[PDB]
Amino acid sequence: SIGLAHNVTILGSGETTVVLGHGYGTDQSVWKLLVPYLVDDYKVLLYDHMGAGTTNPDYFDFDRYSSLEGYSYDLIAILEEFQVSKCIYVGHSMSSMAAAVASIFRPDLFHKLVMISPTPRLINTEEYYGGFEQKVMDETLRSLDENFKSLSLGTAPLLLACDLESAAMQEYCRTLFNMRPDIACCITRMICGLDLRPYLGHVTVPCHIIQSSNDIMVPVAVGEYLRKNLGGPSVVEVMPTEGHLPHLSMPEVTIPVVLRHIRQDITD
């Protein structure tokens, strides 16, 4: 079944359902400091994206997940299986962009998207600053297969903006390295090459854009770019946090921001 394949967990109760989608390198346990604040007021659905170390490697389809919509279709199938409709989807990074694409295919399934550290494209063009030059991304992936561990460990403190003794860093590394390496390399190459800019105009569900003020993967101006190009309402809140996973590394600041955007719909 879909539920067992994605380790679907349902908690709480209520009229409205909140769906929590972890990002790259983590699993649904990343939400553990947020869920207790939701369960009395909402039904909460948690799931692992295919390829997370907690999922069966034999279910990972290398063709399916070399494009982001493999993840979008899985999400739709999950929401259909549990007859969830008009949900409040909270996602980190790629997960929030997969939900955005899913919301083009199936707007009925989403009341709004709460997006932690989203970007539609990492790589610079002449008129778009995504944060990375084409050839520096090419180098960072040159022999990605042979250097995965080395590159991941050496970049993780910069990506998360916390150090190797930090509780957040040790938790991230645990789940990151439970992925099968060829799986992680496939997902990584897919994320780094994404260009969702052509689809933003087709998103119509309200989007809440939450970002760190210093994120090596997400220039602050990318939040504004999203706000300008999304097809429906949106709002941007830049937090006084650093790092690409502020919900994991700086929950004391971040969890109250996420809760406010879950609870409060966008105004005029």
Residue 80 sits in a domain of what CATH number?
3.40.50.1820
Contacts of 43 (CB under 8 A, 6+ apart): 10, 11, 12, 13, 14, 16, 17, 18
Domain residues for the domain of 170 are 1-268
**C-alpha to C-alpha distance for 241 and 251, rounded to whole angstroms:** 10
In Å, what is the CA distance from 68 to each residue of 64, 252, 253?
Answer: 8, 31, 30
In order, the DSSP letters of the chain are -HHHHTT-EEEE--SSEEEEE--TT--GGGGTTTGGGTTTTSEEEEEPPTTSTTS-GGG--TTGGGSTHHHHHHHHHHHHHTT--SEEEEEETHHHHHHHHHHHH-GGGEEEEEEES--S--B--SS---SB-HHHHHHHTTTHHHHHHHHHHHHHHHHHTS-TTSHHHHHHHHHHTTS-HHHHHHHHHHHHT---GGGGGG--S-EEEEEEEE-TTS-HHHHHHHHHH-SS-EEEEEEEEESS-HHHH-HHHHHHHHHHHHH-----
Q: Are 257 and 210 in contact (CB under 8 A)?
A: yes
Q: Which residues share a beta bridge with 230?
A: none
Q: Nominal resolution in Å?
A: 1.7
Write down the catalytic residue from 111, 208, 244, 261: 244
Catalytic: 93?
yes
To the question of whether residue 229 is assigned a binding role by annotation, the answer is yes
For helices 167-176 and 144-160, give the axis angle rounded to 10 degrees.
160
Method used for this model? X-ray
Total number of domains in the chain: 1
Catalytic residue list contains 244 = yes
SS3 track for 191-220 = HHCCCCHHHHHHCCCCEEEEEEEECCCCCH
Choice among 6, 22, 48, 93 that is catalytic: 93
